[PDB]
């Protein structure tokens, strides 16, 4: 794979948002650090405009499935990967269960060495006093099962799963996730057969740090494949 290549060691990884829920509009930069070999990343995100209106762990899945790990003998269905450098085009629409929902498109490809994922973020049909925009949500995240599948019709793929955000009162707020990625060079990439990502976040705080902003440690790892 040509994409492959570029992954073996330590990318440097930018992400930059801008986003507008129910009319709250803000911007996010983040930085850090992806090694596929041990399918980990390490991100800092700051909001630049002053105060996140929306929880940050409902950004999570917003802020580059590329540094996944894919075992050697599931490498032949690495899309993500495979669309490098050139990249490709994520969407999303994730429905918040009884609230609102993001729609989401991002590119994400490189920069020089530097893997960068650029978000637009469109949130609407939020209530007031709901989880989302009365920041009820836990500052913690699960672990979860990321299910894709090809797409020929657009040679690239659709995934699905669901989130699980745990609410302070002790309840969960579901929030499904419906996603598609298309190729943005015209190189050949890698159909991949059914399978699935195994999820697991950390989310932290930077002591000395005092704008609005998230640590996050994530380990990814493709499986559904013997």
């Known amino acids: 794979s ?35 070999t041990y399918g980990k990343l390490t991100l800092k995100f700051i909001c630049t405009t002053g105060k996140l209106p929306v929880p940050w762990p409902t950004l999570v899945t917003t802020f580059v499935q590329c540094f996944s790990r894919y075992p050697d003998h599931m490498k032949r269905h690495d899309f993500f990967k495979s669309a490098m450098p050139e990249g490709y085009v994520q969407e999303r629409t994730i ?10 498109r991002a590119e994400v490809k490189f920069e020089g060495d530097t893997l960068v994922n650029r978000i637009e973020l469109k949130g609407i049909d939020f209530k007031e006093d709901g989880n989302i925009l009365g920041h009820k949500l836990e500052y913690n ?8 599948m090809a797409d020929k019709q657009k040679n690239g793929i659709k995934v699905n799963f669901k989130i699980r955000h745990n609410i302070e009162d002790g309840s969960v707020q579901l929030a499904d ?3 598609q990625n298309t190729p943005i060079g015209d190189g050949p990439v890698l159909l991949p057969d059914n399978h699935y990502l195994s999820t697991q976040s ?12 998230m640590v996050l440690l ?7 494949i013997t």
């Open 2 to 36: 040509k994409g492959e290549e570029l992954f073996t060691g330590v990318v440097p990884i930018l992400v930059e948002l801008d986003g507008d829920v129910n009319g709250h509009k803000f911007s996010v930069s983040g930085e850090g650090e992806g090694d596929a």
């Open 95 to 104: 429905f918040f269960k009884d609230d609102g929902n993001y729609k989401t």
């Open 141 to 148: 995240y699960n672990s979860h099962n990321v299910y894709i």
């Open 177 to 179: 996730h419906y996603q």
């Open 202 to 213: 950390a989310l932290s705080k930077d002591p000395n740090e005092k704008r609005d902003h």
């Open 218 to 224: 994530e380990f990814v790892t493709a499986a559904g």
